[PDB]
Design a protein around this ligand. Structure first.
Ligand SMILES: OC[C@H]1O[C@H](O[C@H]2[C@H](O)[C@@H](O)[C@@H](O)O[C@@H]2CO)[C@H](O)[C@@H](O)[C@@H]1O
Ligand SMILES: [Zn+2]
Ligand SMILES: [Zn+2]
Lengths: 41, 424
């Protein structure tokens, strides 16, 4: 059941942190591109 | 969660004189204002790969070099990049013990080898061979004492007898340890473990004697001999037993070949204090003053630092240590050493207690000499890499992890896309 306990820690890690390292990962994944598709159609 | 940034947590085994190490940490603290904390957990060599798999644990991990390859294979240690002026301070064979896949993964500290410790008052002339110990015991048991007590629960201590006439872990061929060729159940190892089992069947040793029982019995003068390393010398010194440290006994005319360990200090790959640890290890611990503080607590043996090893050359107990080291073999650092020690520990325990025959215990140990799924999961590497200092190499580790794990890639997308709309 520790996989969920780590999924609980990964979850709370990604929702509270906003470091520029993850910013580079967001942009490299095209996340800003996929969100800009949602704000038109 | 996050390893504390701006301080150093150190893990070292409980028998290694952590108090002397803490003293060099206090000098590091007064010179830098950085707090150094030294801890000694139980089952240390097992706790570290479990907590560091998620990016937790200490900044610096101390252990013999044989565990560090598995730590490095699982991405738990940072690459050690010392200057040439510092690599020339330590003997090259100590650097070889911590080199893995071409990269240095730890700083060598000291070289450890088991020696025969004996009470000179009970035994003016210690036995040269294993064969004469049964008669020495029945001679000493007549006056209530006993001949030899050493730890039978860890295969590290019975390995010299097992390897003396042919036993080996993995064969070395063309600079590569042969995982396929394991010499755990050959005739030389069979005759070695049989001699230990036979001496239990004849009541010359008890199958349950461990480290505490064997050490106390020697320090209380209850046994004439024991088998241990240099860290045990200072406890014998406070017991005032007139002891000697000499070569290990021979078996079938062959010198017993202990597994040589190089105590080494690794650096956590998820530590934000990698520069502080390099400064601590190179400029404070690996000095004459730093090693003298640790050695005065519990002796280190044959230290890797050339300068202090010269100051420590004139010790007869260290000369005996190097003699047994030169007769023994350097331990492999390959990841499969974890499964090797596990297999041999089970065989020695299952043969000494009377549970399996010597041939059945070794044959089962010969089979089990292969590491199985003690590798971190796809959910732990991400947590460990995300909990590690940021770099273009660390960020690329996160991406290759997600690209090979879709539902982790899915969880990262959904959690970050929701974040990206928080700041619109
Ligand atoms: O017995 C298996 C065990 O042997 C070695 O552990 C040694 C260690 O190297 C010494 O410094 C001292 O602490 O005694 C230990 C044995 O109790 C290996 O280093 C270790 O990996 C292995 O499991
Ligand atoms: Zn953590
Ligand atoms: Zn402890």
């Amino acid at each position: 059941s520790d996989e969920r306990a780590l999924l609980d820690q990964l979850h709370t890690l990604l929702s509270n942190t906003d470091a520029t390292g993850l910013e580079e990962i967001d942009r490299a994944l095209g996340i800003p591109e996929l969100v800009n598709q949602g704000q038109a159609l | 969660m996050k390893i504390e940034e701006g301080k150093l947590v150190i893990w070292i085994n409980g028998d290694k004189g952590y108090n002397g190490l803490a003293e060099v940490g206090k000098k590091f603290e007064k010179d830098t204002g950085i707090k150094v904390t030294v801890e000694h957990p139980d089952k240390l060599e097992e706790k570290f790969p479990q907590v560091a798999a998620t990016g937790d644990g200490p900044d610096i991990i101390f252990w013999a070099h044989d565990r560090f390859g598995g730590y490095a294979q699982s991405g738990l240690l940072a690459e050690i990049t010392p200057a040439a002026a510092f690599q020339d301070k330590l003997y090259p064979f100590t650097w070889d013990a911590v080199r893995y896949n071409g990269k240095l993964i730890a700083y060598p500290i000291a070289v450890e080898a088991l020696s025969l410790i004996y009470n000179k008052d009970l035994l003016p002339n210690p036995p040269k061979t294993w064969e004469e110990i049964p008669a020495l015991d029945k001679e000493l048991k007549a006056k209530g004492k006993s001949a030899l007590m050493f730890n039978l629960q860890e295969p590290y201590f019975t390995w010299p007898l097992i390897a003396a006439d042919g036993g080996y872990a993995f064969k070395y061929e063309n600079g590569k340890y042969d995982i396929k060729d394991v010499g755990v159940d050959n005739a030389g190892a069979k005759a070695g473990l049989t001699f230990l089992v036979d001496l239990i069947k004849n009541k010359h040793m008890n199958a349950d004697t461990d480290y505490s029982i064997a050490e106390a019995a020697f320090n209380k003068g209850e046994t004439a001999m024991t088998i241990n390393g240099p860290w045990a010398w200072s406890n014998i010194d406070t017991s005032a037993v007139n002891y000697g440290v000499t070569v290990l006994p021979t078996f079938k005319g062959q010198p017993s070949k202990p597994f040589v360990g190089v105590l080494s200090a690794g650096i956590n790959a998820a530590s934000p204090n990698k520069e502080l640890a390099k400064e601590f290890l190179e400029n404070y611990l690996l000095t004459d003053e730093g090693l003298e503080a640790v050695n005065k607590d519990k002796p280190l043996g044959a230290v890797a630092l050339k300068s202090y090893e010269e100051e420590l050359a004139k010790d007869p107990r260290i000369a005996a240590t190097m003699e047994n080291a030169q007769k023994g073999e350097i331990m492999p650092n390959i990841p499969q050493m974890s499964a090797f020690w596990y297999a041999v520990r089970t065989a020695v325990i299952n043969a000494a207690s009377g549970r399996q025959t010597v041939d059945a215990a070794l044959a089962a140990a010969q089979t089990n000499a292969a590491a199985m799924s003690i590798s971190p999961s796809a959910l732990q590497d991400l947590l460990r890499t995300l909990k590690s200092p940021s770099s273009p190499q660390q960020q690329q580790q996160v991406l290759n992890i997600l690209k090979s794990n879709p539902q982790l890639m899915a969880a990262f997308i959904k959690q970050r896309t929701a974040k990206y709309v928080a700041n619109q």
